Design an enzyme around this catalytic site. Structure first.
Site, PDB file in Angstrom:
ATOM      1  N   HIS A   1      -4.439   6.461  -9.448  1.00 37.60           N
ATOM      2  CA  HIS A   1      -5.877   6.725  -9.362  1.00 37.60           C
ATOM      3  C   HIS A   1      -6.166   7.567  -8.118  1.00 37.60           C
ATOM      4  O   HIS A   1      -5.291   7.723  -7.265  1.00 37.60           O
ATOM      5  CB  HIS A   1      -6.695   5.416  -9.406  1.00 37.60           C
TER       6      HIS A   1
ATOM      7  N   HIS B   1      -8.020   7.199  -5.265  1.00 42.78           N
ATOM      8  CA  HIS B   1      -8.135   6.672  -3.908  1.00 42.78           C
ATOM      9  C   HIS B   1      -6.938   7.103  -3.066  1.00 42.78           C
ATOM     10  O   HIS B   1      -5.813   7.163  -3.556  1.00 42.78           O
ATOM     11  CB  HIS B   1      -8.273   5.148  -3.947  1.00 42.78           C
TER      12      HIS B   1
ATOM     13  N   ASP C   1      -4.955   5.780  -1.217  1.00 45.02           N
ATOM     14  CA  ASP C   1      -3.777   4.932  -1.108  1.00 45.02           C
ATOM     15  C   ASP C   1      -2.764   5.183  -2.223  1.00 45.02           C
ATOM     16  O   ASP C   1      -1.706   4.563  -2.263  1.00 45.02           O
ATOM     17  CB  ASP C   1      -4.182   3.448  -1.028  1.00 45.02           C
TER      18      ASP C   1
ATOM     19  N   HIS D   1     -11.260  -0.617 -11.956  1.00 47.34           N
ATOM     20  CA  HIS D   1     -11.278  -0.490 -10.501  1.00 47.34           C
ATOM     21  C   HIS D   1     -11.906   0.866 -10.186  1.00 47.34           C
ATOM     22  O   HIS D   1     -12.713   0.997  -9.270  1.00 47.34           O
ATOM     23  CB  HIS D   1      -9.847  -0.553  -9.969  1.00 47.34           C
TER      24      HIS D   1
ATOM     25  N   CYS E   1      -4.111  -0.475  -8.626  1.00 49.11           N
ATOM     26  CA  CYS E   1      -5.270  -1.165  -8.090  1.00 49.11           C
ATOM     27  C   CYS E   1      -6.191  -1.679  -9.188  1.00 49.11           C
ATOM     28  O   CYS E   1      -7.329  -2.063  -8.922  1.00 49.11           O
ATOM     29  CB  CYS E   1      -6.024  -0.236  -7.144  1.00 49.11           C
TER      30      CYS E   1
ATOM     31  N   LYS F   1      -6.366  -6.896 -10.130  1.00 48.65           N
ATOM     32  CA  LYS F   1      -7.027  -7.629  -9.056  1.00 48.65           C
ATOM     33  C   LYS F   1      -7.201  -9.127  -9.345  1.00 48.65           C
ATOM     34  O   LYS F   1      -8.324  -9.628  -9.436  1.00 48.65           O
ATOM     35  CB  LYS F   1      -8.369  -6.994  -8.668  1.00 48.65           C
TER      36      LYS F   1
ATOM     37  N   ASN G   1     -12.512  -3.657  -3.553  1.00 46.60           N
ATOM     38  CA  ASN G   1     -13.372  -2.492  -3.329  1.00 46.60           C
ATOM     39  C   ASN G   1     -14.074  -2.030  -4.602  1.00 46.60           C
ATOM     40  O   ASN G   1     -13.457  -1.392  -5.455  1.00 46.60           O
ATOM     41  CB  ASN G   1     -12.532  -1.340  -2.771  1.00 46.60           C
TER      42      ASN G   1
ATOM     43  N   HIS H   1      -2.144  -4.320  -4.285  1.00 49.74           N
ATOM     44  CA  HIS H   1      -2.513  -5.117  -3.122  1.00 49.74           C
ATOM     45  C   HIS H   1      -2.223  -6.612  -3.186  1.00 49.74           C
ATOM     46  O   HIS H   1      -2.752  -7.384  -2.386  1.00 49.74           O
ATOM     47  CB  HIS H   1      -3.992  -4.887  -2.826  1.00 49.74           C
TER      48      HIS H   1
HETATM   49  C1  LIG Z   1      -8.903  -3.842  -3.586  1.00 53.41           C
HETATM   50  O1  LIG Z   1      -9.576  -2.858  -3.907  1.00 53.41           O
HETATM   51  C2  LIG Z   1      -8.805  -4.301  -2.134  1.00 53.41           C
HETATM   52  C3  LIG Z   1      -9.231  -3.242  -1.127  1.00 53.41           C
HETATM   53  S1  LIG Z   1      -7.915  -2.033  -0.780  1.00 53.41           S
HETATM   54  C4  LIG Z   1      -8.786  -0.531  -0.994  1.00 53.41           C
HETATM   55  O2  LIG Z   1     -10.015  -0.546  -1.125  1.00 53.41           O
HETATM   56  C5  LIG Z   1      -8.013   0.786  -0.990  1.00 53.41           C
HETATM   57  C6  LIG Z   1      -8.294   1.659  -2.227  1.00 53.41           C
HETATM   58  S2  LIG Z   1      -7.985   0.802  -3.809  1.00 53.41           S
HETATM   59 ZN   LIG Z   2      -8.536   2.297  -5.324  1.00 54.29          ZN
HETATM   60 ZN   LIG Z   3      -5.705   0.392  -3.746  1.00 49.17          ZN
END
Ligand SMILES: *C(=O)CCSC(=O)CC[S-]
Ligand SMILES: [Zn+2]
Ligand SMILES: [Zn+2]
Ligand SMILES: *C(=O)CCSC(=O)CC[S-]
Ligand SMILES: [Zn+2]
Ligand SMILES: [Zn+2]
Lengths: 217, 218
Positions: free
Chosen positions: A74, A76, A78, A136, A155, A158, A164, A194
């Site tokens: 995705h 984000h 990370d 997500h 992600c 969860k 997030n 995570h």
């Molecule tokens: C799950 O989303 C916990 C927070 S870690 C985060 O927001 C990084 C991008 S998924």
């Molecule tokens: Zn994310």
């Molecule tokens: Zn993440």
């Protein structure tokens, strides 16, 4: 702050963990994979930074594995943090069309190769990519490894909280989680971005959190 | 940040889940049990904090149950976090002789009652404690519930990766997993401290991880 970690998960499958500060969540660890395919390797999600991305690439090159390509689950940072570095080294990078559009929308470097639809084979019979629908994030996809019965949830998985919700589609998340669970209940292992590794039950836990999540809205 | 939850796992058997941040592992979930015995209840491991412990104890008293006593699988705070509070409120706390010795070495409040040896019955014919030998920690022990074929594995049961190795005994863990596998291969449900519930297969998985741990360490 903690250093990147690379732990063997199963034959030909490694889990790489990077850590980074995240607004409101403190220091959060991120798990991705490195899939081995005949002396060659593939990155499933990049570490947050370009430095850890290189350390990872370098770690595997020293072990005899050429980096054939990288896939991001995705948009984000990370999962896409090391795409600028990877592209600069001419290493094939992939992301769904929805992901690249979001990356472009936020002023980020995009993957070189895109794809869309329900299923897509990064590598025939070895690395398959599945899109369960928005959850997500609008673009989140998962990666399935047929041979080892391993699923990288990213992600989207969860199990203890939706985390997030900045870009989450809480209305669709439960429908998407239902779809994912019925499709990969045959999974021997589920790897969250995570959370620690588990089995097909992480699919049920995710579904419950999503459902809870919508009710709770 | 996620709130404490108490889900019924069986009849007279509940699973309490608490969470907390652990450097290098993020928000870690922690499972523990609550076994019922005639309007009474025993605590298998305690939540990280005194507060969660309080909420836990209450939820049950609130339901009409007396807190007879509590037992911790090992010294790490995710098992002994609420011993201080349980003692303060004058509630019977048990921890192995090695556990209380480690707690004492780490400047932590020990459990009122100790015990040693391979087998020990917190409650005869109902609740049994077993020590498979060093593993996740030098003191880790497990809990067996004969009347339900349910084994609380604790932080010793690490089916998908050994986890925090800070106090692990890598050489001894594989033999202990072997001992544990045979001793309780007749389990209907194995409850890990950091993974979801499963069956005897988790005993096999743990052993494999341990072995891969020692081989991967030399
Ligand atoms: C799950 O989303 C916990 C927070 S870690 C985060 O927001 C990084 C991008 S998924
Ligand atoms: Zn994310
Ligand atoms: Zn993440
Ligand atoms: C397994 O150890 C996963 C991390 S939880 C921890 O390290 C503290 C309680 S053992
Ligand atoms: Zn521990
Ligand atoms: Zn633990």
């Amino acid at each position: 702050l903690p250093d990147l970690k690379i732990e063997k998960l199963d034959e030909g499958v490694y889990v790489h963990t990077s850590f980074e500060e995240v607004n409101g969540w403190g220091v959060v660890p991120k798990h991705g994979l490195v899939v081995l395919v005949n002396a060659e390797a593939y990155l499933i999600d990049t570490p947050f930074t370009a430095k850890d991305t290189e350390k990872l690439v370098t770690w595997f090159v020293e072990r005899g594995y050429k980096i054939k390509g990288s896939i991001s689950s995705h948009f984000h940072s990370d999962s896409t943090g090391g795409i600028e570095w990877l592209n600069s080294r001419s290493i094939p990078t992939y992301a769904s069309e929805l992901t690249n559009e979001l990356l472009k929308k936020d002023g980020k470097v995009q993957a070189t190769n895109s794809f869309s639809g329900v299923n897509y084979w990064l590598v025939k019979n070895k690395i398959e990519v599945f899109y369960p629908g928005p959850g997500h994030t609008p673009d989140n996809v998962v990666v399935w490894l047929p041979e080892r019965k391993i699923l990288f949830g990213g992600c989207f998985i969860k199990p203890y909280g939706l985390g997030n919700l900045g870009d989450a589609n809480i209305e669709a998340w439960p429908k998407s989680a239902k779809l994912l669970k019925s499709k990969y209940g045959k999974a021997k292992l589920v790897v969250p971005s995570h959370s620690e590794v588990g089995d097909a039950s992480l699919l049920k836990l995710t579904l419950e959190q999503a459902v809870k999540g919508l009710n709770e809205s």
